[PDB]
Enzyme design. Structure first.
Site, PDB file in Angstrom:
ATOM      1  N   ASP A   1      34.088  -3.315   1.203  1.00 54.78           N
ATOM      2  CA  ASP A   1      35.229  -3.867   1.934  1.00 54.78           C
ATOM      3  C   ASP A   1      35.068  -5.364   2.187  1.00 54.78           C
ATOM      4  O   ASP A   1      34.048  -5.955   1.820  1.00 54.78           O
ATOM      5  CB  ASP A   1      35.440  -3.104   3.237  1.00 54.78           C
ATOM      6  CG  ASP A   1      36.891  -3.097   3.671  1.00 54.78           C
ATOM      7  OD1 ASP A   1      37.617  -4.041   3.300  1.00 54.78           O
ATOM      8  OD2 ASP A   1      37.316  -2.126   4.333  1.00 54.78           O
TER       9      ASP A   1
ATOM     10  N   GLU B   1      43.725  -3.406  12.451  1.00 54.14           N
ATOM     11  CA  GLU B   1      42.281  -3.459  12.690  1.00 54.14           C
ATOM     12  C   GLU B   1      41.958  -3.662  14.187  1.00 54.14           C
ATOM     13  O   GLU B   1      42.645  -3.124  15.063  1.00 54.14           O
ATOM     14  CB  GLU B   1      41.605  -4.517  11.803  1.00 54.14           C
ATOM     15  CG  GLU B   1      41.906  -4.328  10.312  1.00 54.14           C
ATOM     16  CD  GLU B   1      41.136  -5.276   9.426  1.00 54.14           C
ATOM     17  OE1 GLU B   1      41.784  -6.047   8.681  1.00 54.14           O
ATOM     18  OE2 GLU B   1      39.891  -5.177   9.395  1.00 54.14           O
TER      19      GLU B   1
END
Ligand SMILES: [Ca+2]
Ligand code: NA
Length: 804
Positions: free
Chosen positions: A289, A489
């Site tokens: 990621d 997020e």
């Protein structure tokens, strides 16, 4: 030894593809192989760099469109793709012609792209309980992605979310692994095609299933936090989506940001290799990621051998790719990354690119799947999305059967979300947070108000828009659209479950309308269940609409009758997340021992129901410290990492190692905020200290005070360990063996320790405020401060105070 099932039983290797892979490898240099493993992002990559290095892939990060545009024609996208493609096919400079590929995140459609169809976020899709719908959304997504010249899309997201405080909850289909298992393979085959003759052919894309593994299980739902669970639980709860995704031949798996029992997944060979690749049998490639490698022990932005050795095959390093490339090359040549490992990485990634057809297809703009610009935002796809919207809605309350509302009525539409597409779309929608989006960023989308107005107009009714609930003609009913603001997020991490706890603005609007004796239907936009008993009480009907995406008319379709006054669509959605009855039900999940939800998993009213919801309880659940390390290093403070063989290292950043780069490793971890803690790993004899830059006598204010800190011990020290406090080269105020308080720390989670500084047998100016010594230990530290009295929740590591 947890047994994970082998699930790679359908997809068989293609002998021709393997032959090409091997022929390519036999002749490649270390440099070319590594090049296949590095992934720059378009905000930082130049065509010249692609020509020089021939990176195996590159990323459409979403922060900018190609050429710096906010908006770009499909032709512009295809030109950019062509430019990169030709740079990669150029064997001048790098010595080989291996086609690169473009990858992109596809959170809910091709959602980085202006004009793309935005499907409902996963939570609503989960509510829909419709596997075929999921597969079709995958096929539509594949076409919209292909229309921009991109070969590789990241989807599905298979997190199983157990604590709704996580800011990424809406990216998950369910709190329950079973639904996620049913869905994941459908999304995979939808994007890539079924295993068989059409596997990865035509408009089908390479897919990445995210994220492996456990990111929906972090403690208190902290984003990128710590997942505390045994391996069987990791398997049985958090991995279900991967069983079906791997079974359906998903080509790529993305590793997760979180840690598992204190260790970052990106550096964990047991998870990424032994479990994912050996036992589950995954034959594709692992991609990391966004700069995740920087969080791995011993790693930084420009180097991470450990992640590669752990089983990562492609490194997402958007900005620092060039330095990372050269460091990885030196590491392979030095032997700290074996060539067999890069060989395996290249095999796995080329298996995907070659089987997809990078060698057989033309340049992006000339490909067959590139000749249909109308795929991007296609009417057909919006029709699909609208269906998904309708099926995602969950009817929580419908007293006296006020819904559905006669389309010919006089209706007032109110609430901040009534005509705000950015709120209905949520995060990962053209922009990252969505906060700065306005309706003009969503061409061809339909706000909820606009859909209602369209149908009411067709039916000869009357409709008015007023966010603040103002009206001229008293309406027959008010539809109030309210909810969370968009987020993505950690920005969406919360600590309290009560909706708008700070302001209660929506509640005021609802009660105002109720006070005027106007019937109220609430459309609630959110990425998760929240505690809304007060708002529920102020509503006659209440609909959980989640984050429906671009097709807001899907709401009208269900809430309004047709022109003839008959039901046109009924509710079908059912909760895939449990709805809380109390504001502190943080971990409310089906099959829990004590399961007391307001609305259970699987709940959802329909027009066939005649159920009233009663009035619900609106009752809610219930100084001068001197900081040394709270969220960050205080003035005059530094970390020190000292090993056996080298000079002590002074570190003030997010990470570091001792001199020998091996004995003592420091990283950043997440207690509440991002990077508010530091984790540490002792592999050999070494001492960590939190130290003053200039030796400072202890402030008399804290002479009979405490050193207080939060500590998590991931792995208890086998060879023992020593905790010293307030030292001065000659001696310390306290010297405490870890063995003497281990039973306090055996839950492998955080504890607040208070350490009295004034004991019996108590001079010199202090140089190490804190010091921990061991040969083998794993822990994290946070919130180190001097205090006069022990904080309430603190535990005292006490001492004889007989002398006082
Ligand atoms: Ca739950
Ligand atoms: Na090349």
């Amino acid at each position: 030894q947890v047994n994970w099932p082998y699930v790679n039983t359908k997809l068989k290797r293609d002998p021709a593809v393997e032959a090409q892979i091997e022929k390519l490898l036999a002749k490649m240099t270390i440099e070319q192989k590594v090049a296949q493993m590095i992934q720059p992002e378009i905000g930082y990559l130049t065509v010249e760099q692609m020509r020089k290095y021939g990176f195996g892939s590159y990323l459409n990060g979403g922060n900018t469109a190609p050429y710096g545009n906010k908006r770009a024609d499909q032709a512009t996208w295809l030109k950019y793709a062509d430019e990169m493609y030709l740079a990669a096919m150029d064997s001048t400079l790098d010595g080989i012609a291996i086609p690169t590929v473009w990858g992109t995140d596809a959170m809910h459609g091709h959602s980085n792209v202006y004009g793309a169809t935005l499907f409902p976020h996963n939570i609503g899709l989960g509510a829909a309980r419709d596997t075929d719908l999921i597969k079709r959304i995958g096929q539509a997504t594949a076409k919209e992605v292909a229309a921009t010249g991109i070969e590789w899309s990241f989807a599905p997201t298979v997190a199983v979310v157990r604590d709704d405080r996580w800011g990424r909850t809406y990216e998950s289909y369910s709190e329950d692994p079973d639904l996620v298992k049913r869905y994941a393979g459908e999304m995979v085959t939808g994007i890539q095609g079924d295993v068989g003759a059409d596997f990865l052919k035509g408009s089908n894309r390479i897919a990445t299933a995210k994220h492996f593994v456990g990111d929906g299980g972090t403690e208190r739902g902290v984003d990128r936090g710590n997942t505390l669970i045994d391996e069987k639980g990791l398997r049985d709860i958090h991995s279900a989506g991967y069983f079906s995704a791997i079974n359906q031949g998903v080509q790529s798996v993305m590793a997760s940001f979180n840690s598992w029992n204190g260790k970052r997944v990106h550096g964990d060979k047991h998870l990424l290799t032994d479990v994912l690749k050996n036992q589950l049998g995954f034959d594709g490639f692992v991609v990391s990621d966004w700069n995740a490698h920087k969080f791995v022990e011993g790693c930084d932005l420009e180097q991470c051998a450990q992640a590669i050795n752990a089983g990562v095959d492609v490194i997402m390093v958007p900005e620092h790719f060039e330095a990372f490339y050269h460091n990885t090359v030196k590491q392979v040549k030095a032997g700290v990354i074996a060539e067999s490992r890069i060989n395996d990485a290249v095999r796995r990634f080329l298996r995907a690119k070659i089987r997809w057809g990078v060698f057989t297809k033309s340049k992006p703009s000339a490909r067959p799947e590139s000749q249909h610009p109308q795929w991007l935002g296609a009417a057909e796809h919006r029709t699909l999305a609208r269906e998904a919207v309708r099926k995602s809605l969950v009817l929580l309350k419908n007293n006296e059967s006020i819904l559905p509302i006669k389309a010919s009525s006089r209706i007032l539409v109110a609430g901040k979300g009534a005509n705000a597409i950015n709120m209905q779309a949520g995060g990962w929608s053209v922009s990252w947070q969505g906060t700065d989006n306005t309706n003009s960023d969503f061409p061809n989308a339909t706000s909820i108000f606009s859909g209602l107005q369209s149908q009411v107009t067709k039916a000869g009714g009357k409709i008015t828009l007023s966010e603040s609930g103002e009206y001229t003609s008293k309406p027959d009913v008010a539809i109030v659209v309210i909810g969370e603001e968009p987020y993505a997020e950690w920005f969406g991490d919360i600590e309290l479950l009560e909706f708008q706890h700070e302001t209660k603005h929506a509640l005021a609007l609802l009660k105002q309308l109720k006070a005027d004796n106007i019937p109220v239907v609430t459309v609630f936009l959110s990425g998760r269940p929240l505690w809304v008993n007060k708002e529920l009480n102020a509503s006659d009907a209440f609909v959980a609409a989640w984050l429906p995406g671009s097709e807001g008319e899907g709401v009208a379709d269900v809430l309004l009758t047709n022109k003839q006054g008959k039901t046109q669509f009924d509710f079908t959605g059912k909760l895939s997340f449990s709805w809380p009855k109390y504001d502190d039900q943080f971990t409310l999940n089906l099959n829990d021992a004590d399961y007391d939800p307001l609305f259970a998993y699987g709940y959802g009213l329909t027009y066939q129901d005649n159920i009233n919801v009663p009035v619900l309880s609106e009752k809610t659940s219930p100084s001068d410290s001197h900081p040394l390390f709270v969220r960050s290093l205080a003035k005059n403070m530094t970390w020190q990492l000292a090993d056996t063989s080298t000079q002590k290292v002074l570190a003030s950043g997010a990470s570091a190692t001792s001199g020998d780069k091996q004995s003592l490793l420091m990283q950043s971890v997440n207690l509440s905020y991002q990077e508010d803690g530091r984790g540490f790993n002792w592999r050999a004899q070494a001492a960590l200290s939190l130290s003053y830059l200039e030796p400072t006598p202890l402030d008399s204010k804290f002479s009979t005070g405490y050193l207080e800190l939060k500590m998590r011990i991931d792995k208890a020290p086998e060879q023992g360990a020593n905790l010293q406090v307030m030292c001065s080269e000659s001696n310390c105020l306290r010297d405490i063996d870890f063995s003497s308080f281990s039973q306090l720390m055996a839950d492998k989670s955080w504890h607040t320790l208070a350490i009295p500084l004034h004991c019996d047998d108590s001079e010199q100016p202090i140089t190490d405020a804190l010091r921990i010594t061991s040969q083998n230990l794993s822990l994290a530290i946070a919130d180190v401060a001097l205090t006069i009295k022990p904080s309430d929740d603190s535990i005292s590591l006490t001492c004889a105070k007989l002398e006082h």
